[PDB]
């Protein structure tokens, strides 16, 4: 049963789903806790984004979240704080197989992200650290030969520059998906982070269509359910539909307001 | 400003609200994290219960959640894992002023809980450690003289025996409130933690009435608005209306379901 | 897949193996780390003992080691620091289903350990916290109804007194297994923790025979292959065959020595 | 009362004091603990420096120190380990509003530090992560519109090069203060980290005067009380007058020596 | 060098100094941090008290502070949160050799504290875990045979009752020292923790004299040089002369005040 | 005795041994725990490598491992995640004296690593942070004057490029040792991380010889005992002969298999 566990441990199920065109519904994890990560792994999402960029996580807290999520069907995706080969290698070492790389502005940057995930001759990943959690400390059979094909690289586009360069980014082998950051894009476009303007929505919708038609997976984070459904209709394949901190804050506020109202009606 | 900060830090605002008969709406905290504690401290609850009994908290995690909540209006209440004077001493040292003590079965046990929170001659609290976070390392003026009156002891009744002893429990000086846990009571009564039976509900309602009419604050953990209003109309004063882990799981699941994940 | 995950999470596979009479080979975990726990969970042991008694673990570190081990076939067993119902409640809340309870001296103490793991009417476990990791925050269907039967209580006998009381201990319903710690027994018997004396070995062997013949599982911690086979031939069912700290120190020292460091 | 809390949470009180010319007396925090941070927040300092450069802190320990200090009147300032926009954004995300940026050598570097703290069009800060502790998870009203003006950027000058470039650094909009590192400056000047030589003191004093006369706030760390008072007389506005580790070590040593002397007098 | 390291690690240098009648100057550690513990280990104190009773420490933080202090000449003493054999066992396992046991009221309790630190037949310490940090994972040669004699048990007297029982406490074999906490005693005596009353001071001085004249070491926590010299002249042998949290707060405040912050 | 402790604390014993030509046998630490570090410090190795590159460590966990190891005879060496002066300075601050710097490709990079460890005029280390654990919070007498000479810089060569540049790397003053990464070298040479090919072994053996004959210390990590002995015979001076995670995994698997076999023989 150890044998079968390790055989099964290599396959990147999120990647397989993207390649099959199966839309994957996700939740962003900013609570930076292995405890809430496990709780949320039971909620039914296809994927969970462990945010190493804008939540107080580091390689060690990423590791404990991966350990928490492991037995659940929900698949982990990890965002490093930047497109940094050193950060990427440390994340791969602890077992990350799907990366959401921020601030990818052009094809050279996209290529650098891909190369950081692949062993020679395909990239610059060091074979010497294969013995970490990535290969389960040398228990996954034929790990070195199998690893490159199971890496899934998703690049974020969040500026006018990146949109301009989207066709060349799409041409990069090993870019499996392209994620759009709508608030950052809006801000770069002069709309102050409010994506609900025609010019911003036009840019977003056109990019989703272009990514999908290039044979790659479009992604986006959108807390507005109606917009999320629109992006799915346009062929988006990895759509994060909320953020754990927001879900918690908004549910808690709604609860305090409703019951607070009851206390006030009894004791004016 | 420091002097004014410290002069203000001593007052137990939760206790003052209970004594004024102002109902207090609370949320249970089982996420055992200073980060979600701060986030939830901004949501608008009157009180937050840092659960040391059934969440993976210890004195250290209670400390950081107290630090996180401190600047917010929401008031922290801590549940130790048992009515243990040592555990109570440690929670007080880190700055806990309102305790929710589990499994208080009789007046002797209620008295023991109270005595654990009070300096001599009123109790057995060791003055040794006035110098911990409780006195802000000896910055709160007249701390020793002021501390006993700002302690707020709430006792849990969870069994048929505790219910039988309620009148005697209510007579214990220093018991400020009595909390009923409907699930545990239902379980002890034979209804497998399902509180939605007339016999359980009858026992709960009568207890709330007795507690309030004795001049003490009734508390309860509930999830239904209409039942909450009913317990409020019957005099309940510290009503916890959800649990952080549950709120998060249910919101998350509802969201995933809306997309057919 | 979530529904199927949760339906499967309830079953105590270790308990099922003991009841089927399948010997289970274990490793003691004293490294008190979720990282080495995961590494060791892949090594091929049937069970891993997360030691809360003689390693620097607490409920929080037990939790993270349970999360680390979860996806592997190796089954976790947790040793609390004492036969304490509060500590037992907390370990159960974080998801412990198999307990190794130290210093059980008599049937009363064995019964107390069992009762601590069971909901009413079978025990004193508080239903209050079905909602912790134990029920996966209320996702495991019919958790309350199913939990008691999946709890596995193993009691340690460490003294001459415990040995004298063994027949009565074996009669306690809900005692699934009895573990003998050869070092502590040897110490109590006057042999300074050296178990390699006929009198100690005679006492150990007879206990294993009595336990198995009563229909319960014998357990022991040993390091020698031939002695392990002997205890297995005598009916032992949960045999721990090393300790992580020892394995690591001895491997490290042997390596350094081979280079004349 | 939540409402009023969040309204009050936005204002950078340290910045306001600097702009008003009110000298601010500070303590350096290198103990890297939220517990001693809270203790020291009660001591009466105007500001506390959470040192992310030369103490064993990271974004997560910075967060817990900010949470500890929050209810006290003492204001937190955070030093990142370098002038790195990625580190700066993570610090801003967890709620940092005043940054002390090390090793700023020229105006381009000073400009880069400022831009890392401001949303478009003023800088390169991403609006997408406003939902972290910075906006108290979207509770601070009009956070995006208010954030830029409450950021306070202090740049360190600690080399001959930086002194040479001081006039241009002073010309950078959004540089609110310039901190002098006297030991590093001394070392760069050939005086081996001992600042008590005329040439080093001349450089330091002249820079304080120049910074203040440019309309900006001078800062410095100085454990020598007499020098601290001199720098204040010259118009310095954020003066750190000790370091927690040093205060603890020196107080402890003095205590052991005095009582040790007593034990020795009784038992020669 | 390893063999020589381990041969040297067993010796309790603090105990040896007390037995030689060499006064030992100490600092209380409440900062609950391995980093400040190391810093303070270099300051020149003979001993450092890692407070498990009134600081937010647990067995894990005690462990890291022991590791931090280890290479320095200053010797660690640990205060458990209570006279609890389980807590004592856990502290010993991580390598504690000198215990300061709070709230020892009578000889029975003193004997219980001693017995908790000793292997059979001298006590009830479980040999099971010689293999933890205490034996350096079985590297200290002849650990089991040597451990009992290197344990140093110091008991706290905090009440009028404990004072009455002092003669009997002093007669307990294995009580190496008796510590008086002036604040708690003052509190029990009716003086609200203010030890600067003749009646309290009279009781303290007489106790120090009785302890030393019985052949045991007196200890106390004080802050005044002249009072320290007086207690030293009266025979005190382990004198704590400040508290880390207090030293830091007072130094910090004095500094801020000098600049009119 | 404090005095004598601090006098003794400055000397880098690992460096002294390398300079004396005494071979030093090491173990790699990837378990990222101060508890197992202390355990392993008692095992008899000359040195222990605290891996900040490919294990889930950070400056703070490095600090706790240094504190754990301190009283033992085994000497700590720390690998930062990259040749980064900011990371290097933080490691030096917490008391690191021997650094194993990854991915050093040429002499300029080797020089940069050395300079990051030395105070002016020899390098760019800041004197201002000498007051951290490095000087034991200002207790080590004459720390500033003594520090440079006790720093020990070991550079990793792990590519064909680095091998090409080895003669120039050897010429860099302050490079005390050169470590060869055999699996990474093999991968860069087209042999897929398996070092057991003649061309890879020829490269490795020749480099060891060249490093030693230049008057510098050769190093390598090799879990194969027979190869380790060959490299020692060729004059290697710091040879890591295993990895803690591997030793633990392999010992545990052997144990489970042997006793599992016994259970199976009793209960077929």
For the residues of C127-158, what is the DSSP string, one character each?
GGGTTTGGGTTTTSTTHHHHHHHH-EEEEEE-
What's the burial of E3, exposed, middle or buried (CB within 10 Å: 0-12/13-18/19+)? exposed
Would you say C46 is a known binding-site residue? Answer: no
DSSP lists the bridge partners of residue A99 as A78, A153
Q: d(Cα D60, Cα D90) in Å, to the nearest integer?
A: 10
SS3 category, E110: helix
What's the burial of F210, exposed, middle or buried (CB within 10 Å: 0-12/13-18/19+)? middle
What is the rounded radius of gyration, in angstroms, for the C-alpha atoms of chain D? 19
Q: Indicate which CATH number applies to the domain containing D267.
A: 3.20.20.60
Q: Which one, of D258, E72, E67, lies nearest residue F137 by Cα? A: E72
The answer to whether the CB of C20 falls within 8 A of the CB of C234 is: no
What is the rounded radius of gyration, in angstroms, for the C-alpha atoms of chain F? 19
Domain count of chain C? 1
At residue E228, what are phi and psi to the nearest 5 degrees? Answer: -65, -45
Selected residue of E28, E56, E243 to mutate for chain B interface (largest B Cβ count, 10 A): E56
- Which residues of chain F are within 8 Å of residue C208 when distances are taken between CB atoms? none
* Catalytic (active site) residue C197: no
How far is the alpha carbon of D246 from chain F, nearest alpha carbon, in Å?
7
Treating both helix axes as pointing N-terminal to C-terminal, what angle do A59-69 and A34-41 enclose, rounded to 10 degrees? 30
Q: Do chains F and B touch (3 or more CB pairs under 8 A)?
A: no
F137–D245 C-beta distance less than 8 A: yes
Cβ burial F31-55 (10 Å sphere, 16+ → b, else e):
bbbbbbbbbbbbbbbbbbbbbbbbb
Would you say D70 is a known binding-site residue? Answer: no
D181–F126 C-beta distance less than 8 A: yes
Q: Measured in whole angstroms, how far is the alpha carbon of residue A2 from the centre of its chain?
A: 29
At residue E40, what are phi and psi to the nearest 5 degrees? Answer: -70, -25
H or E segment to which residue D76 belongs: strand D75-79
- Which residues of chain F are within 8 Å of residue C220 when distances are taken between CB atoms? none
- Listing DSSP states for B22-68 in one string gives --EEEEEE-S--HHHHHHHHTS--SEEEEESSSSS--HHHHHHHHHH
Q: d(Cα B102, Cα A214) in Å, to the nearest integer?
A: 61
DSSP lists the bridge partners of residue A153 as A99, A175
Q: Chains near F, with 3+ CB pairs < 8 A?
A: A, C, D, E
C64: nearest CA partner in chain B:
B56
Q: Which one-letter DSSP state was computed for residue B205?
A: H
Q: Which residues of D touch B (CB under 8 A)?
A: 1-2, 5-6, 34-35, 38-39, 42-44, 63-64, 67-68, 70-73, 133, 136-137, 139
How far is the alpha carbon of E229 from chain D, nearest alpha carbon, in Å?
6
D42–B2 C-beta distance less than 8 A: yes
SS3 category, B7: helix
F192–A144 C-beta distance less than 8 A: yes
Selected residue of E81, E120, E122 to mutate for chain C interface (largest C Cβ count, 10 A): E120
Q: d(Cα A77, Cα A97) in Å, to the nearest integer?
A: 7
Q: d(Cα C170, Cα E202) in Å, to the nearest integer?
A: 58
SS3 category, F76: strand
Q: Which residues contact B217 (CB under 8 A, 6 or more apart)?
A: B18, B154, B176, B177, B178, B211, B237, B238
SS3 category, D153: strand
Output the known binding site of F for substrate.
156, 183-184
H or E segment to which residue E243 belongs: strand E238-243
Q: d(Cα A143, Cα A136) in Å, to the nearest integer?
A: 9
Q: d(Cα B164, Cα B173) in Å, to the nearest integer?
A: 19
Kindly list the distances between the CA atom of residue B166 and the CA atoms of B107, B178, B203, in Å, as whole numbers in the listed order.
8, 9, 11
In terms of residue numbers, what domain contains D267?
Answer: 1-268
Q: Which of D8, D43, D54, D254 is catalytic?
A: D54
C42–A2 C-beta distance less than 8 A: yes
How far is the alpha carbon of B195 from chain A, nearest alpha carbon, in Å?
20
Q: Which residues contact C224 (CB under 8 A, 6 or more apart)?
A: none
H or E segment to which residue A260 belongs: helix A244-266
The answer to whether the CB of C204 falls within 8 A of the CB of C185 is: yes
Q: Which residues contact C244 (CB under 8 A, 6 or more apart)?
A: C27, C28, C29, C30, C31, C36, C40, F248, F252
Tokens at residue A87, please?
Answer: 């950060």
Q: d(Cα E191, Cα D71) in Å, to the nearest integer?
A: 34
- Given the structure tokens 């065959």, which residue do they identify? C241
C243: nearest CA partner in chain E:
E131
Output the known binding site of A.
156, 158, 183-184
Q: Measured in whole angstroms, how far is the alpha carbon of residue D177 from the centre of its chain?
A: 10
Tokens at residue F17, please?
Answer: 């041994």
Q: Chains near E, with 3+ CB pairs < 8 A?
A: B, C, D, F
E5–F71 C-beta distance less than 8 A: yes
SS3 category, C120: coil
SS3 category, A222: coil
Q: d(Cα D2, Cα D141) in Å, to the nearest integer?
A: 11
Report resolution in angstroms: 1.6
- Which residues of chain E are within 8 Å of residue C195 when distances are taken between CB atoms? none
Tokens at residue A207, please?
Answer: 């990019």
Q: Which of E54, E160, E164, E250 is catalytic?
A: E54
Q: Which of F5, F35, F42, F54 is catalytic?
A: F54
The answer to whether the CB of A151 falls within 8 A of the CB of A119 is: no
Would you say C158 is a known binding-site residue? Answer: yes
Output the known binding site of A for substrate.
156, 183-184
Q: Which one-letter DSSP state was computed for residue F129?
A: G
Q: Do chains C and D touch (3 or more CB pairs under 8 A)?
A: no
- Which residues of chain B are within 8 Å of residue E246 when distances are taken between CB atoms? 131, 137-138
Would you say B188 is a known binding-site residue? Answer: no
Q: Which one-letter DSSP state was computed for residue C217?
A: E
């Amino acid at each position: 049963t150890e044998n079968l566990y390790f055989q099964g441990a290599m396959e990147n199920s999120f990647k397989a789903a993207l390649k099959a065109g199966r839309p994957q519904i996700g939740l962003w994890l900013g609570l930076s806790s292995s405890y809430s990560a496990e709780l949320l792994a039971g909620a039914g999402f296809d994927w969970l984004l462990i945010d190493g960029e804008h939540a107080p996580n580091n390689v060690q807290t990423v590791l404990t979240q991966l350990q928490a999520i492991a037995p659940y069907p929900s698949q982990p995706v990890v965002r490093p704080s930047w497109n940094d080969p050193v950060q990427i290698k440390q994340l791969l070492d602890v077992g990350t197989q799907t990366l959401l790389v921020p601030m990818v502005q052009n094809a050279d940057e996209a290529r650098e992200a891909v190369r950081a995930t692949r062993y020679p001759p395909a990239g610059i990943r060091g074979v010497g650290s294969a013995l970490a959690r990535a290969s389960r400390w040398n228990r996954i059979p034929d790990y070195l030969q199998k690893a490159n094909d199971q890496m899934c690289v998703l690049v974020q586009i969040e500026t006018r520059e990146a949109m301009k360069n989207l066709p060349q980014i799409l041409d990069v082998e090993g870019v499996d998906g392209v994620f759009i950051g709508p608030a950052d894009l809006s801000a770069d476009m002069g709309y102050a982070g409010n994506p609900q303007h025609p010019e911003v929505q036009a840019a977003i919708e056109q990019a989703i269509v272009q990514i999908r038609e290039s044979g790659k997976a479009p992604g986006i984070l959108i807390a507005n359910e109606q917009l999320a459904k629109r992006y799915l209709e346009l062929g988006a394949l990895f759509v994060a539909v909320g953020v754990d901190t927001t879900l918690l804050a908004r549910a808690a506020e709604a609860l305090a307001a409703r019951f607070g109202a009851q206390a006030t009606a009894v004791k004016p």
